[PDB]
Structure 1
Amino acid sequence: MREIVHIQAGQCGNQIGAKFWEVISDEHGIDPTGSYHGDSDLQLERINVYYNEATGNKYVPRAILVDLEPGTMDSVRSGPFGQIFRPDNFVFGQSGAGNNWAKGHYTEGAELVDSVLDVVRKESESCDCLQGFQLTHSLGGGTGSGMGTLLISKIREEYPDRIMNTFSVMPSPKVSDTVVEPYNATLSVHQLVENTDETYCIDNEALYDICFRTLKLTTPTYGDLNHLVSATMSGVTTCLRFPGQLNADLRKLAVNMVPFPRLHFFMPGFAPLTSRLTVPELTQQMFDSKNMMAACDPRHGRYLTVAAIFRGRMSMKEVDEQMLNVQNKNSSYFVEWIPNNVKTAVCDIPPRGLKMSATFIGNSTAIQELFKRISEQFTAMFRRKAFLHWYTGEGMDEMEFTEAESNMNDLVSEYQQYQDATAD
């Protein structure tokens, strides 16, 4: 068995983490008490990727809940499926992080990180053959941002040959009022470029726009945004959770998606999206900018690699024809020096309530628009040295901000270098 250990850190991390476990538990036929009451052996075939099995035929998520304040995790334990989590896998402090990356990364987070590592170590020791880890967190706050990236580095020290995957929520002024979020995000991206193998860029700017403009939601709630995130996370993990040939584990996905180690930031997508359907329509929608969970137009760059997952009962001949159709008619937007860079998976089991769906995972150079947006908000404050005392007060130096900014600026230019590269 190829186990994945799941970690959710901070408010955002535990929120979308709880929904993810709610959504895939329903897909795998597991109720809040941990018992299986489904009707398809495909639900249980690879159940061990995400669930341990205890006696009594109970399935426990291989999940670790981390926060520097008990608020969100108390709500998780009290909410639906709260009893399915292992009680000893709740690790929480009291002081909080106060939307301060330095507090999460160097101060309060470092005081709590060893007790988290004890739980990670315990779950990993009980693995037949550990694949790696997936972390859910935001980059705009303090506990998911600083302590999340601290956990990544500490885990990588003890599991250096395992895959590190993150679902990272990018901050947006449309969603969050907090002023220092470009700082926390840039410091976090500085870590993700070095210490993760693959990162799904869940952009709060895109989630808002989808809810507002597409779903016709005047005042989107976090519940609304998190519905897109959970549906997305379900889709992008389908190949890991159900029998299949393509991208069936974290390492094969990484080998197919990451041609250069720093360029591991994926633009996820989902179809259909409509307010409260044919294979050609499903394929056209999943490649539409409107359906991307990152606020980037793929027609402003080029695709290095793409993974596509179709779910439901449909003609595989038609899927193959339409996937070829999209590549041939948009050949300008796929780099020619990576032949056959789009891979397509098909799973018979659709998500809840849909007859068929498509999930898109793109490694596009247009992701630079996301990092340019964060760098823009970062440098507008860092030239004025606004709010720097929150971070120097924890012991940091202006040099650490400067290095983080230039590393993210370097990442942007590297996407541009490969966007401009040609075969001849």
Structure 2
Amino acid sequence: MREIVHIQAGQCGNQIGAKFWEVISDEHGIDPTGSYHGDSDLQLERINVYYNEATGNKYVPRAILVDLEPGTMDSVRSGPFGQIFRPDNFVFGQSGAGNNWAKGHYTEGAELVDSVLDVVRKESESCDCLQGFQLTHSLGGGTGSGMGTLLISKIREEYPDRIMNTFSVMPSPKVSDTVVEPYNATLSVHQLVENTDETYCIDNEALYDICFRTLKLTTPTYGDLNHLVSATMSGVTTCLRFPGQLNADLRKLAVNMVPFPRLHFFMPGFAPLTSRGSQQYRALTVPELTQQMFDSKNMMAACDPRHGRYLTVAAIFRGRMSMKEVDEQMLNVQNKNSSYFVEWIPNNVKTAVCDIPPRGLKMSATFIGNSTAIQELFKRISEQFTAMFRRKAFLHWYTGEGMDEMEFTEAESNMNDLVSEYQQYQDAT
């Protein structure tokens, strides 16, 4: 069966990843010690996907952790699930990146990529057949932007035929937690156009919006932004792990969802998101999930979807459903929104229906959509970039680590060609 390797780079990466392997564990019914104590027998058939076996009935995730520069080491180890990862996988060095790209890709990345890929190959050959290389990294930072895209330059090189999904947390128009941030996005999108099959554009503002405009949370901590990301991360590989009525791999999505090989920057949604105790004033049905998925205040990429045409979308439904209400709710949205889609594609939406819900819910979904409205996430950075680069503002912390000025103009030429190949299909014809 089909098996996935999960890689975690940048300090944003394992913080999502530590919450990621808690959602996966409770979805399979697996304790902190890896002992299976699940309810049914239906969740052992694809433990093989994420958890390879161990000696006595214990399960270990195939989780490489590149990002444990030692400030994060003894919190992930001294966490809820520090007794579940294999301790040889904790690959790191000393003197972390420093919110620097060139100290992730050229200087400290080159003296660590050999120690990572010696564990990547030891986790590939313990598998029957691989397809998946999930990389949870973030743009903007250090390790997650230079070293996160150094491995994709190497892992795609040693595996030219694997589906490479990178759940890439992106910068924001207002929330600026990094001063150098328009450099670590331009230099990393230049790598993630060439070297990935799909990559999910997630922002913190549209995660800050849902925890206030929809979930009504008083103080959304960083755990409650990762608990929303991870509910999508276990929503793309649901049909891999669980039986269904219309299955969808990580490749039936990434053949349908992508028209042209550069147009693979996705915005993920999730439903049902709502705020309650145990008294909520609604009814979980198939037309109830549909309106919330397509709603412009339940994206995650923090762009306005009604500014552009959706190229094609994928609605990975879960739970027990009826396929007529699935195929007819996906029809009426496409007709009411005839300008909001691309006219010159026959049917835009595809459907994927699994048969096992989450633990507490009755039904759920995942809106993965490829839109031209993500032109706004790349135009804002390319305006912030050429403002900093015109003065040659922060460049002596990068050219003092080995780079050249003629790699900066290479990176802005590539991002400006995505905006050209998004403004085209946003226009009508």
Q: Could you say which TM-score interval applies, normalised by the shorter chain?
A: over 0.9
SS in 2 for 1:55: coil
Indicate if the aligned counterparts of 1:312 and 1:350 stay in contact, CA closer than 8 A: yes
Equivalent in the alignment of 1:192? 192
Aligned to 2:386: 379
Equivalent position of 2:60 in the other structure: 60
How far apart are residue 158 of structure 1 and its match? 0.8
The structure-2 alpha-carbon separation of the partners of 1:354 and 1:288, relative to structure 1 and needing over 3 Å to count, comes to same
Q: CA deviation at 1:332?
A: 2.1
Counterpart Cα distance in 2 of 1:218 and 1:375: 34
CA offsets, 1:197-255, max 9 Å, x none?
Answer: 00011112211222233333465422222121112212233223222465632222211
Instruction: Report if aligned partners of 1:68, 1:109 keep a CA contact under 8 Å in 2.
Output: no
Q: Retained in 2: the 8 A contact 1:312–1:357? A: yes
Q: Tell me the TM-score normalised to structure 2 length.
A: 0.94
Gaps of 5+ in 2: 277-283
Structure 1 counterpart of 2:428, from 415, 421, 424: 421
Shift of 1:43: 1.6
Say if 1:247 and 1:253, in contact at 8 Å, map to a contact too: no
Deviations along 1:76-129, one digit per CA (max 9) or x if unpaired, are 121112211111111011110001011011111111011000000000011101
Other structure's SS at 2:15 match: helix
Change (3 A) 1:33 1:100: same
Q: CA deviation at 1:172?
A: 2.3
- Indicate how the Cα distance of structure 1 residues 53 and 379 shifts in structure 2: closer, same or farther if over 3 A, else same: same
> Which digits, 9 at most, give the CA deviation of each residue in 1:143-198, with x for residues without a partner?
01100000001111111121211000002264442100111011111100010000
C-alpha distance in structure 1 between counterparts of 2:242 and 2:338, whole Å: 31
More divergent stretch after superposition (156-165 vs 204-213): 204-213
The answer (yes or no) to whether the contact 2:68–2:90 under 8 Å persists in 1 is no
1: CA distance, partners of 2:92 / 2:117: 13
More displaced stretch, 118-127 vs 302-311:
302-311
RMSD between aligned residues: 1.8
Distance in 2 separating the partners of 1:205 and 1:237: 25
CA distance in 2, matches of 1:109, 1:200: 24
Q: Cα deviations across residues 248-281 of structure 1 (Å, max 9, x unaligned)?
A: 3222221111111111111100112233533212
SS across alignment from 2:343: coil
Task: Report the alpha carbon displacement of residue 45 of structure 1 after superposing the two structures with TM.
Answer: 2.2
1:138/1:307 Cα in 2 relative to 1: closer, same or farther (>3 Å)?
same
1:46 Cα deviation from its structure 2 partner: 2.1
Q: Secondary structure at the match of 1:345?
A: strand
Closer/same/farther in 2, CA of residues 220 and 389 from structure 1, 3 Å limit: farther
Conservation of the 8 A alpha-carbon contact between 1:271 and 1:285? yes
Q: Is the 8 A contact 2:382 2:416 kept in 1?
A: yes
Check conservation: 1:306, 1:362, Cα contact below 8 A.
yes
* Post-superposition offset of 1:53: 1.4
More helix as a share of residues: 1
How many residues are aligned here?
422
Q: Deviations over 1:302-324 (max 9, x none)?
A: 12221102222333332222122
| CA 1:390–1:275: 2 relative to 1, 3 Å | farther
1:389 matched to 2:396: yes
With over 3 angstroms needed to count, the CA separation of the structure-2 counterparts of 1:280 and 1:33, relative to structure 1, is same
Contact 1:68 1:96 in 2 (8 A): no
Q: What is aligned with 2:369?
A: 362
